[PDB]
Design a protein around this ligand. Structure first.
Ligand code: HDX
Ligand code: HDX
Ligand code: ZN
Ligand code: ZN
Lengths: 318, 319
């Protein structure tokens, strides 16, 4: 059933497991994810950026999500707005029936962040909707990146009331996180500190692994993504043990789908039925996600708890 | 709103135009089609094969259709089951809120065809849902066993079964290779007017992708191997339309528009790996392929010609 981020990650924290949070944009991507988490009876976060919502004209993604909720009433499923910039987009996602939002004001100074966030928290928590926010900014370390300062994090969380905090520890968006693979520099030491000080679920953004299998595959069949590196996966398992409950994953899927398509295009240039290549692309998503969910630790946990509806979530906030 | 096949094709018939029936499989496909008919204020048939229902575990495809019915309340939108094989496949779709079904018994003898149909007609008509059936089999004319529609048989078929619209066999077939070349186009469109006169109902043309130049050329320019693809010329279809063909089934053209678009992105920008980066283009190319096609069929500008009768109130036409 439609779950809050609050409860879902509540349970993650408790059992020391992480829940992958997977960006979806069309029918085949949701189906690729759902396949993976149903098989392993895992809770799931399906997340849509404002761009996802624009691309699917909003209503299309809503209905596709309603389809995954109806198809699998056993799974806790949290529909999350990824990277809200404004109260405006937070509203739009709420009215679409999302059970969570993220307000990303990490780029304004601390007080403006806190300002902008309280505003969304006041709004969202009225309907039972969870709120992820972020302190610190994304980007590698190797410069204008602010890594989360744990003592500020504590205050930020007390000041704002958010259910989850996204941290900055040297991860960025996209397929090109680090220049070499020798020099992967993560600041995961502070994760345990941030988790302890705030007492809430933490979120890792830019968490794709850029797995070599898929990478070479793209380049092998016409693609041009040569020096692409991601975050190593034991780093993510380490951060999970230290308090990370939500693992944001988008690029890895993008690549899985694209690799399976280029492959059909090369091997069978005579085929033009989109089912012929989109189908293989769906299944590539599933295959790539299965080990990942297993490493995260969320597998088997789908039936642990009674999902609280948004109506009842309003009570947590009064 | 949701609209029966009876009303959509009844209006098409009376005004002498045809409505394109487009096969749907996923989000970027429904969107491509809907952007087109919306821009041209045309009615639409969104059709689902059994195989497209498989592809999408039904509910996903159900829900996309809802999103379009809801996003565009202005447009009359018939949800139609294409190529129903059994009576049970029909049941499954009426319940997914379809406004219309095809029962395809064209490979059985007349009497077994009429029987299998009247069965689907009885079940469907009672829930206000429209039924398309077919007399004659698809296949190219150029040893033969293709069974072109005999206008005398068609008269008797509609008198027996009571179907809302009739798919006829005039020399088309499915897919990208309908004829041996662009000069060898052998179609049987002269019977259309006689089938339309004798039966008095809307007719449907299956296998009617046109394989336009731009789509084929882009597949073949960007790594594709489809050098001998050939479809139905739009001229033939417009001929057929004005003699009584009111519904035109198009699928391969959309499949080809999508693939070309992705192959060109794959070649012009090999760095790009976000599926939105190529499926968006693939959505847009669908839309652009379909604009001239919709206008030729003639349904452009007709979305607000009529107030749409509910499945519910359709239960009276038959009773
Ligand atoms: O976590 C995320 C994430 O939330 C987004 C959303 C922004 O996407 P948009 O382009 O706006 O639709 C993208 C990437 N990653 C992590 P990675 O997979 O790049 O490591
Ligand atoms: O008329 C039809 C039609 O009814 C279908 C449905 C079958 O599709 P499936 O492969 O079963 O999902 C497809 C194509 N055409 C005409 P064309 O586009 O091949 O010219
Ligand atoms: Zn992110
Ligand atoms: Zn057909």
């Amino acid at each position: 059933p439609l779950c809050t981020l609050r409860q879902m990650l509540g349970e993650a924290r408790k059992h020391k497991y992480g829940v992958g949070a997977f960006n979806v944009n069309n029918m085949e991507q949701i189906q690729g994810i759902m396949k993976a988490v149903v098989q392993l009876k895992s809770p799931v976060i399906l997340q849509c950026s404002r761009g996802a919502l624009k691309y699917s004209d909003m209503i299309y993604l809503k209905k596709l999500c309603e389809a995954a909720l109806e198809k699998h009433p056993d799974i806790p499923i949290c529909i999350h707005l990824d990277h809200g910039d404004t109260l405006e987009s937070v509203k739009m996602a709420i009215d679409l029936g999302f059970s969570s939002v993220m307000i990303d004001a990490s780029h304004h100074p601390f007080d403006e962040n806190v300002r902008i966030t309280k505003e969304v928290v006041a709004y969202a928590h009225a309907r039972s909707v969870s709120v992820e926010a972020e302190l610190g900014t994304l980007g590698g370390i190797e410069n204008t990146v602010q890594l989360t300062e744990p003592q500020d994090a504590k205050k930020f969380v007390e000041l704002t009331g958010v259910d989850a905090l996204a941290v900055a520890i040297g991860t960025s968006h996209g397929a090109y996180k680090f220049k070499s693979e020798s020099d992967i520099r993560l600041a995961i030491d502070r994760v345990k500190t941030i988790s302890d000080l705030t007492g809430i679920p933490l979120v890792m953004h830019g968490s794709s692994s850029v797995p070599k299998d898929v990478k070479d595959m793209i380049n092998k069949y016409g693609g041009k993504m040569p020096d692409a590196v991601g975050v190593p996966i034991e780093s993510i398992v380490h951060a999970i043990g230290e308090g990370v409950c939500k693992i944001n994953v988008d690029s890895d899927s993008r690549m899985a789908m694209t690799g399976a398509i280029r492959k059909v295009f090369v091997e069978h240039p005579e085929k033009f039925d989109p089912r012929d290549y989109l189908g293989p692309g769906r299944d590539a998503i599933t295959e790539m996600l299965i080990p990942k969910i297993k490493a995260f630790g969320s597998a088997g946990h789908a039936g642990d708890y009674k999902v609280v509806s948004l109506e009842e979530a309003k009570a947590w906030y009064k």
